[PDB]
Design a binder for this molecule. Structure first.
Ligand SMILES: Clc1ccc(Nc2ccnc3[nH]ncc23)cc1Cl
Ligand code: NI
Length: 316
């Protein structure tokens, strides 16, 4: 039955949030390896799931337009105020990006040059659970393939929300669904390889060892360094994944995930090499040092600054 909407087709069903495109570019944020749940199903219209509902998003120079599909048969309508506040928080639109870009730009000429072309890169505020298991799937992987795994994971273990066209949207599973005796085998069947072990084992560990998803919520109010350390006790969660989660889901803007790509950017575009270590390649200690470097340079929103560069390095 139900079809993916565009702003032309069904304007009655859209609400808008004042938002300069220079504070937010959907095309630089939603598929730049923060969330893996957004797809441009028709041009300049992005559809994906947010907290148990499907949205479609598009924008002009000065407005962010959105529509919500509730599925569980309700009557069709525009977004409510509450839903719009959900969306405002997801894009952390209280935070001014113009001021951050200008502050980063003032100590960093490399940034200033790349930041001209790549405005409106900001950090999503994601659900901890979805973010943890998504980034467990990120090891030795690329966005396209991670997106594939996460999709199949959600279809197989998460509640069906709605279907639009040929796309069936599922909510992100809960810990208990991922912790079960078959979960690893099923996830292997779904193409996750060794990552399947870490999904099930981390689901199991968060439940039994940490008393379930309220623990992740506690980490949101815990300090960065305590949150990071705690996450690294989990199967398949090391410094990189923990930093992704910290930055993207636990409101730690100073977290800087270091993987082979941030290594590459740091060395190529900043001329950085490990100093306080001898070993010249990536290593846990050198990776830590690189994160410290960027905090030192950019300040307590270093992770946001890094996201600009990451997002810019994905486009040629
Ligand atoms: Cl395969 C893959 C996909 C996405 C990411 N994501 C990031 C890593 C570091 N800093 C970031 N800032 N914003 C996104 C992002 C990593 C991998 Cl390893
Ligand atoms: Ni060199």
């Amino acid at each position: 039955h139900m079809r993916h909407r565009t702003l032309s087709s069904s304007p009655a069903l859209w609400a808008s949030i004042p938002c300069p495109r220079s504070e937010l570019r959907l095309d630089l944020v939603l598929a730049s390896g923060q969330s893996f749940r957004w797809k441009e199903q028709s041009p300049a219209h992005w559809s994906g799931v947010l907290a148990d509902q499907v949205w479609t998003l598009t924008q002009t120079e000065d407005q962010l337009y959105c529509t919500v599909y509730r599925g569980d048969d309700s009557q069709v309508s525009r977004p409510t105020l509450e839903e719009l506040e959900t969306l405002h928080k997801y894009f952390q639109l209280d935070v001014s990006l113009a001021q951050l870009y200008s502050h980063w730009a003032s100590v960093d000429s490399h940034f200033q040059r790349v930041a001209q072309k790549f405005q409106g890169v900001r950090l999503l505020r994601q659900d901890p659970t979805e973010c943890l298991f998504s980034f467990i799937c990120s090891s030795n992987n690329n966005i396209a393939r991670i997106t594939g795994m996460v999709e199949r994971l959600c279809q197989a273990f998460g509640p069906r929300l709605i279907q639009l066209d040929d796309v069936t949207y599922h909510g992100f599973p809960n810990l208990h669904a991922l912790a079960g005796p078959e979960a690893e085998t099923h996830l292997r069947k779904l193409g996750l390889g060794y990552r399947a072990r870490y999904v099930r084992a981390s689901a199991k560990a968060i439940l039994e060892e940490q008393g379930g998803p309220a623990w992740l919520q506690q980490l949101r109010v815990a300090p960065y360094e305590e949150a990071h350390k705690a996450l690294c006790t989990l199967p398949g969660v090391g410094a990189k994944v923990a930093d992704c989660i910290c930055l993207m889901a636990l409101d730690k803007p100073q977290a800087v995930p270091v993987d082979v790509h941030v290594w590459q950017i740091a060395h190529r575009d900043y001329g950085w090499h490990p100093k306080t270590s001898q070993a010249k390649g990536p290593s846990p200690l050198a990776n830590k040092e690189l994160g410290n470097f960027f905090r030192n340079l950019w300040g307590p929103y270093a992770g946001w600054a890094q996201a600009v560069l990451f997002s810019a390095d994905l486009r040629q």
